[PDB]
Amino acid sequence: IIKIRITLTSTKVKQLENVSSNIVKNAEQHNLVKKGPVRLPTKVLKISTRKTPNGEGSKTWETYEMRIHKRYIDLEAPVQIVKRITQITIEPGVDVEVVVASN
């Protein structure tokens, strides 16, 4: 009996949604108590870049952009179930973090 908080970070939303739906449909199917996938706001990471690498013309600017999404699902499970889900769920693009303590 250990409570495990699993937090998922991903820049792509499709693989993150597939991972979260697989986690929810795997957790509900063998009778574990849990919370839903709590949806943090999407971080938008912006940086400014010159339009002029060379010194010709007037100075004007553009912006490069990123999108980062964060979800976290709280679980309650035994140790072997947590270990086998942590072995299964490793996919490229979605980062899986396992938290033991609740403080």
Partner: protein, 202 residues
Amino acid sequence: ALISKKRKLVADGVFYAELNEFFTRELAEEGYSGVEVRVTPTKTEVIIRATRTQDVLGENGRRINELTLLVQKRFKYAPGTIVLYAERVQDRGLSAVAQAESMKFKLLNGLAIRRAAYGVVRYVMESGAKGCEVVVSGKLRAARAKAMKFADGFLIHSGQPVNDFIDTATRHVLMRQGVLGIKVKIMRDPAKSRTAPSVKDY
């Protein structure tokens, strides 16, 4: 270690990009297609998906340990925390002759008839094969011959892709009681093939 989260992910992306460019420029003649890395709590595993694998592992793993030390020395890692894995062509679970000789040596060592079959099927299945089939025919330390077969995965049995994809090796292990038939058939990935109005009623 212990990098802040956006800096951790951007430096991780630089780590993917630097190994991608290093393996693009290094093994250009060994069919380089892509890489993937797996981060375990024990160590870090590099999976080299290069389509000419027999030139990647040379004599007694010399170029494998060479590329392992190239990852080790430049990227500031402890000795033993990186393992570079070979996948595509010279994976030992994709050749039926190697697995037939392997289960030959496993039966000759004195293992079980079932547990060695579990080991060879799991080693073929974890190596990147679509399917496998194990045929053992013999006495099985008894007075009656038994024919008994186990297929795992998805395999084909007829057609022109039979002549293109499967590999079958026939071996005969010599036991203390008699002889036994060793047939290993391995199915590989076909995506790795590089070369008036009317009314009715009832």
